[PDB]
Symmetry: C3
Subunit: 368 residues, 3 copies
């Protein structure tokens, strides 16, 4: 309602759902508002699959970066001439190019998996589909749409054998249950096939007693990220803590909440509908799985009720600067010239400058 920047579950539709897991696909941002039209090629998926199961083979006509949000997983990318599976624990990023086959298995015996992917449609600005080689309960094989003669010619065989072996609809859809022994071989064995990145790998950018913010960037370091102009981020906010009023200089963040709960403040600037320019606040209640859009140069503050884990997909990331409006470091206001503050602000300069030296910590403080 009030908030076009906040998307919870009811905005999440369900493409596929059985007792072994489910796959949610978030609606095209360019509907609710043109406030972020420039995000329209970025569609969000969230996946959840029970222990010892598997998301079946397919590919999309959409670029993809994939990230382990809860639990444990063994993912496989596949090529025309190459396969290459990896095991990914949480806060691990993997990139599945377009047209490349891939499947995900929940390595874990007792605990779950809750994978979150961004998708990037190639053909149609807002749209991507899946292509399954295998038919099943919930979808159809893309080889069924071929001819009797071609299939036979292609595969060197009669229609009956191809059909009986490959085409027939068997499984209860796109996520099926797996043996324990079968798993030991899929794991056993764990190009444009990039290696999996760890989003927490180095020393975190922002860090103190109340919070942490890891961030991988479009760099000479990571060649892939540089190619997409896209940064990946992870924020962790302690219970009772406050991520202070801040913003991103230029990146447009699609944030999605891993776990926990907390308190969103987003502040926009609104032409109605010498025209009055309005500072309208927007707030929202954050819960496991929620999503909030965080446009460029727009201030936000976030307070954690619970131990709060956030994931952040950044667009237009190159040379981004997360600027802060309070604290010792990354304080942008502090940097303003002293006569600059004196004239702008109601108070004197030295007084206004004194209130800035008042808050002596940096990025995260105690909420209250």
């Amino acid at each position: 309602r009030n908030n076009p920047f906040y998307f919870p579950s009811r905005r999440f539709s369900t493409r596929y759902g059985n007792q072994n897991g489910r796959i949610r696909v978030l609606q095209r941002f360019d509907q609710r508002s043109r406030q972020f039209q420039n995000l329209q090629n970025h569609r969000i998926v969230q996946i959840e699959a029970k222990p010892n199961t598997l998301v079946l083979p397919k590919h999309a006509d959409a670029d993809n970066i994939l990230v382990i949000q809860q639990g444990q997983a063994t993912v496989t990318v596949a090529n025309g001439n190459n396969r290459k599976s990896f095991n990914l624990d949480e806060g691990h990023a993997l990139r599945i190019p377009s047209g490349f086959i891939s499947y995900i298995l929940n390595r874990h015996d007792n605990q779950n998996l809750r994978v979150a992917k961004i998708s990037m449609p190639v053909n149609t600005p807002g749209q991507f589909e899946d292509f399954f080689p295998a038919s099943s309960r919930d979808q159809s094989s893309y080889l069924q749409g071929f001819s009797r003669n071609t299939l036979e010619a292609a595969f060197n065989a009669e229609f009956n054998e191809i059909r009986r072996v490959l085409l027939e609809e068997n499984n209860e859809g796109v996520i099926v249950k797996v043996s324990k022994e079968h798993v030991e071989e899929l794991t056993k064995h764990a190009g444009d096939i990039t290696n999996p990145i760890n989003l927490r790998e180095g020393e975190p950018d922002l860090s103190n007693n109340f919070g942490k913010l890891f961030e991988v960037k479009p760099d000479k370091k990571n060649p892939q990220l540089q190619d997409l102009d896209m940064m990946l981020t992870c924020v962790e906010i302690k219970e009772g803590a406050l991520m202070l009023p801040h913003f991103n200089s230029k990146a447009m963040v699609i944030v999605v909440v891993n776990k926990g709960t907390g308190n969103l403040e987003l502040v926009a600037v609104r032409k109605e509908q010498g025209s009055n320019r309005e500072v309208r606040r927007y707030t929202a209640r954050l819960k496991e799985g929620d999503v909030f859009i965080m446009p460029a140069a727009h201030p936000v503050a976030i307070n954690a009720s619970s131990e709060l884990h956030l994931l952040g997909f950044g667009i237009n990331a190159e040379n981004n600067h997360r600027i802060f409006l309070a604290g010792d470091k990354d304080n942008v206001i502090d940097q303003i010239e002293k006569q600059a503050k004196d004239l702008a602000f109601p108070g004197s300069g030295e007084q206004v400058e004194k209130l800035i030296k008042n808050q002596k910590e940096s990025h995260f403080v105690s909420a209250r």
Copy 2:
């Protein structure tokens, strides 16, 4: 009708047409469907001019790559400070930048020329116009839209002389007939003026008894192509042969048929209009001059009735992978893990894997 991916002649309008040749311009893809909205800046032209004739001088506000589809030709690019004509035989690519003057002459005495260009509009997303310095039967000179004073001032002369020499409407339009002797001097003499590429130059990517596929890529090799993110391709399919079910990982191909005829299978994935996802086939009859769009990650199979020559302009080409769904090499299904196939497909793993080792050739086989 049924097929939005298939464009034949009736989709081709005619911008210019006389007894010495004609120029066809294919309608904006973003009309029929938003299924390939992202192709809207790519407009197709096809040109046909008799022996010993010439397409007259002009430029467009549209980038351009040009390719000899049938016959023989001598093409001239021109600059503010430089001219540079080349002779191009078939399967030769030439790039005419934006704002650069150019004309084409049919070098050949008895045989024709059937040039195919892609155009890339600079100003308006879907639209480009021609600018002719000379007036004629079918169009007007862009200097006529200047003033009496300016022209005179610019050119150092009275209006009468400028008009009599340059402006007056003379020719039967934009393609005129040429002398034999005149030709010997235009040929005699055969910057941002790039040299002409040969699309068949090296050793072909795919090759056997039934087919060939040459392809030039956006590479450290070809600097221009790298700049456009655009690959050029040529496929040759023998009579009776089958280009197996395949697709492009990420590139969006605008294919155009040089010569011959054959059998198009295109397989899409269709949301109508937990929603049913439909494998809808699309087919089409291919004839000299036809065009079919070949979106990313979408399977196609093509069988040649006649000796079939195809041209392919690729978009989003960088690190493309043409993936194949049948054959020894570039077989993507083969690469799937063995337990992966067993669970997905109706058959067992070893059985499903046996049907793959059945077809022992690679990319092209005998259709029937």
Copy 3:
């Protein structure tokens, strides 16, 4: 009216206006016509502030390049960890990234400042807003849209003190008057903070007795410009002089008139609304502050009534070529093959070629 390419003052709305200056923002080009849809992310601002005043602190969610059009100025960019002010005299370009704080002061005692900026919206294709940390008569502080608790928590203080010092609405809006002494310290002290470029720095590209054209390009030289694919230009046309019929091979120029007045000829190519292709002229009267769009491959001629200063922001600038249709140098017509002219033009080749050697100067001549 008649001209969609010509935008004068009445097209310029007023975002902010007091006795100490004013800020004009030109309407989104994608309204009047889709003739330049591809310019829709480029919005024009023009600023005018009296001697000894200041445009107050803010940032936008829009990239920005800024240029001194008349007078003298001291500009400050600011960061989360860095400030860096420069003094800029006319024809000086400065780049203010997105999310970065900045303010402008009129250094001069008796003379004015008339700054012209291009803005580039990050979030919404055509739209950018300002974000002021300080509240005032004409706008509101973006910290007012925060909460009682957060502000207090963030800043380490009660609501009263924060409000009294920082939040309260004090000034007569966004441009205020400054002391003489205050100025001596702001000037006294005169990252992603780029140094200021001089657009007249080297030896001018085009130059003679009647005109000058300076131009900075997207180069290995200027790294920033290369990043934006954007060239900056300055043209100076003598009273009575003529900038000859010319055009840009590929760049789309947003031109804005610094000072003087003169005579615009723009020549388009018009499908109505084997279709008739029309050379329609467009003209316009140019006055201090006017703006005219100059699409790619489109001819223009400009004659100066008065000493005429033009500013030019180029889009799609990489490897642009300004091509000329008259004069010794950059004459594109001259470059056409001799048999090429003979057939195209009404006259013979040698005659048509003689009228080209007639005008012996290059780029600027005497209008009449």
